[PDB]
Subunit: 193 residues, 2 copies
């Protein structure tokens, strides 16, 4: 019913272009180049080559107090409850909740520019520009070295979640523990249509 | 004032690319009801940056790690380093390599099958125009670019060999006996 307007047609095009390119995370190509000064006269020709490695997605893994987990490979968000042996898969794009963890882990200008952000020293307070009720509020404390010390989040139904972080070990961890395969026996609700 | 805050936040966060933290969490109603409490663990691996390496017709090379753009002319034994931020030109290669939504959302974009034509929203930019042909599988077949001076560069690509590329390629250290002009302030 609501027609496809120019702004959406452009968004759909950006999105398809992106999904195509998402399929190749690295490649090598030979090319032929041809330059033109402005008028049309052939300024230059030649052969060359190009290597590209695209960014990886962000990854995260959180263990709740109840010992159930949330795992993200950047596409899927997996939720797993080892006590009841139940697992839920959902595309991250359609995921709901856990936005602080997504913001924390992605650290992208473009996610940050969706908020009004005041800064007092190491403390930052973020109010959403688009007040649709995704996150009513988000607060975070980050050292100069980038260590996150604490943060809190207000959901749209005024549900507040606060976190105080300790024992912050930097240094890498193996990508295999950010990819989740339901263990034998676990009921899977795969909501990825 | 909001945009300095966003930047500094990001820049603090850029210093760390992975971490493990233990935490204590507390959850609340609108009222203030102590719905939850306990300890838990968080692991994060941040995105790494894009990388590209390009050999020009004249055999000079452009290498990018996401922060620095190195330009090296082995014939005259001269290399230039410049922050990628401060860089001018080579926008097509940055876009191809980054493949970020937010970079694509800076252009009005029309599609016809595999062909896409892009014109910048923010008309004060590097690129007057950018054209690219991408297959369903993500192979880039050709593209072309018009700079602000009406100059036009076209590329026709072949031999697209996907699969891992040695990360030798994307880190550049000036060779001994090459004169470096480090423009990074």
């Amino acid at each position: 019913l609501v027609p496809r307007g120019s702004h959406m047609a452009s968004m759909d095009a950006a999105s398809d272009l992106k999904s195509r390119l998402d399929k190749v995370s690295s490649f090598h190509a030979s090319f032929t180049q041809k330059v033109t000064d402005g008028s049309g006269a052939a300024v230059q020709e030649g052969q060359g080559d190009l290597w590209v490695k695209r960014p990886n997605l962000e990854n995260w893994h959180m263990t709740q107090p109840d010992e159930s987990i949330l795992v993200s490979d950047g596409k899927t968000l997996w939720f797993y409850n080892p006590f009841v042996e139940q697992a839920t898969a959902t595309w991250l794009k359609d995921a709901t909740g856990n936005t602080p963890f997504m913001l924390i882990a992605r650290n992208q200008s473009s996610d940050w520019q969706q908020y009004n952000i005041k800064q007092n020293g190491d403390d930052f307070v973020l109010t959403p520009k688009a007040s649709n009720g995704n996150l009513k509020q988000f607060t975070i404390n980050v050292g100069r070295d980038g260590t996150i010390h604490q943060f809190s989040a207000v959901e749209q139904d005024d549900q507040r979640s606060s976190y105080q972080l300790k024992s912050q070990q930097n240094g890498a961890v193996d990508a295999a523990k950010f990819t989740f395969t339901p263990p034998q026996g676990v009921t899977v609700d795969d909501q990825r249509k």
